[PDB]
Amino acid sequence: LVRSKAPLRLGLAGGGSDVSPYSDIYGGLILNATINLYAYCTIEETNSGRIEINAYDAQCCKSYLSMSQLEIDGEASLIKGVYNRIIRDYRLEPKSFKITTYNDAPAGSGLGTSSTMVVCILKAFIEWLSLPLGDYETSRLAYEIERKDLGLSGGKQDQYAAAFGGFNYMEFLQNDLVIVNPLKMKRWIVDELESSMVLYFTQTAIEAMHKIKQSAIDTKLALLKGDVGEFARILGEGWENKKKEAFDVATGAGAMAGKVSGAGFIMFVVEPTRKEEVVRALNNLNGFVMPFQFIDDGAHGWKIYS
Amino acid sequence: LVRSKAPLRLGLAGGGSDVSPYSDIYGGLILNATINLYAYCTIEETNSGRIEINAYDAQCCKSYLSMSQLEIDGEASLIKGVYNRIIRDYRLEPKSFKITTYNDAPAGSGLGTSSTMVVCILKAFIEWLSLPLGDYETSRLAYEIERKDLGLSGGKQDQYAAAFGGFNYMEFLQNDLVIVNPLKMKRWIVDELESSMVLYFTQTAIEAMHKIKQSAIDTKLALLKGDVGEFARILGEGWENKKKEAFDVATGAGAMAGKVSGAGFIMFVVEPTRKEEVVRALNNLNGFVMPFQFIDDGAHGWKIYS
């Protein structure tokens, strides 16, 4: 059997500049980082002309006939979605296997859950069938499967982070090319940043989007130098800018700055010696603090020889 | 006692764009990587009231009366420069110690020997006196000791490569600001590049420099994908341009491309299965091929308690 896991991510700056058609016309820049919340998958080749699916994340535990393709009932779309593309792209005969899947964060959450799971399933298949697919190809394949085959709309930063891993500076160039600049992060900066962070779960746009894109640049420079204070400043200036309301009762008992991400989730930047104070105050509210650590590795698979 | 060592580096691309005023007017771009050839230094404190210098690199072995500053005789300048600068910057009392020094590469070379050694010496002092100097500060201080305090001329890439380590893409911005993008390099790309390389020792400008600067961008993007062939092309395209004579007996032996670095030093890029041939032919010349490996760490020091 083969197993695989992929990490979820945190958007540090540039969020949105990667989404079409803004990226297509102006070009996007994003700085993100993978965290220790994962999507897992294991694939074991069975010889019962069947395909069993135990997708805890897709509330699905059915069995199907080992076909060449599997219709998208709307159940276990991610797994079926990956499998179908694999059979087509390599023209392989139907396969018999049992596949299990589960995630560390719910569907929404806003941490790239869906893209991370797809990458994770791909990695399993890659390991399971020795597919000639590396980081770039995997991310590409993942996006294509999720954003086209399944008709799911989103940016491009999630597939790549899950596949590549660590702290990345991504350039989304026109003609949908993408450059991933894998950044090495000194251990003290990584530690300082985490001790400075709290994860809390509760036209003229363009002109704004340009500022956001520009923030990816200033944030890179700021964190490379370990200047968390400037990072905090950049987040605030951004928050102020993305307002000129729902639950800012969280920002009420806050720290230095904050940034709101998809799926109802605030990334606070606090003074390390006050981080605990912030976590207790936020914990009194209706939401909860999500403990985490940055993880340097991207998706990967391994085999267990029985 | 304390010990330290710093690696030398290979100028992969953009060489020259880091030199002022060009870096200050147009901005510089550099892609370089440290290699397993080092500068070593050990410093042991003593209560003899003397300062003993044994520098195999500066070819000096003299004892001096412990002072606050040391006259730049023209002997062990590097050590004297660092020692003086540290005594001044930190307003410290005269020091008594024994200091040993040696390098794995000669004066000219073209691997940044001098800057690497200054960084190494600085690292020994930093380790020695628990000085508050990190990567950025160390590089800058090294550039200042060498370039100003000692009048020696040159670029900036060398000081930063030595202190940072690994594959770096440096931005030497206008108004002399510097950004080091520490790049995580996949192991297989590094191994592929290492088996594809041979190290062998023996007004219209600016328009030419704009290309050398550009190459840094093309080279980064080529090596991040493992496209060594594209790297060869860029080096080759850069060669023909560096011609619009001396000991080119070396390039006479076919490979994919070659590149010369500031003095008796050619970098050749060859197909792995053909490397041994290239290496054998060149060694049959009047010079020798220097075996190397890329090293991901920058300068560092350690203490030995007794």
Side-chain angles (χ1 to χ4, degrees), chain A residues 179 181-182 184 186 220 296, chain B residues 135 181-182 184 220-221 296:
Chain A
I179 315 307
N181 296 281
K184 287 201 309 184
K186 288 227 289 299
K220 187 194 64 165
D296 182 69
Chain B
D135 297 326
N181 295 280
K184 287 202 308 192
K220 182 186 67 171
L221 178 54
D296 188 71

Side-chain angles (χ1 to χ4, degrees), chain B residues 287-301:
Chain B
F288 62 165
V289 161
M290 181 56 99
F292 77 95
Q293 293 300 302
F294 287 112
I295 183 63
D296 188 71
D297 281 29
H300 60 277

Side-chain angles (χ1 to χ4, degrees), chain B residues 180-223:
Chain B
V180 179
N181 295 280
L183 305 177
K184 287 202 308 192
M185 286 293 290
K186 291 208 289 290
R187 182 186 64 179
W188 79 262
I189 292 174
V190 179
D191 282 317
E192 183 66 353
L193 195 73
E194 297 181 315
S195 60
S196 296
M197 283 172 51
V198 190
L199 260 243
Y200 179 60
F201 297 70
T202 313
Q203 167 176 48
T204 182
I206 274 136
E207 301 305 304
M209 189 64 80
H210 292 317
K211 288 180 177 179
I212 287 174
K213 171 183 186 167
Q214 180 60 42
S215 69
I217 294 178
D218 311 321
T219 299
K220 182 186 67 171
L221 178 54
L223 288 186

Side-chain angles (χ1 to χ4, degrees), chain B residues 1-4 41-45 98 123-129 301-304:
Chain B
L1 63 75
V2 299
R3 297 178 161 85
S4 75
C41 167
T42 136
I43 295 180
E44 42 189 302
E45 184 199 288
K98 192 187 293 72
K123 254 301 189 309
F125 277 104
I126 298 171
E127 187 60 44
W128 170 201
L129 320 163
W302 66 98
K303 286 195 165 190
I304 294 290

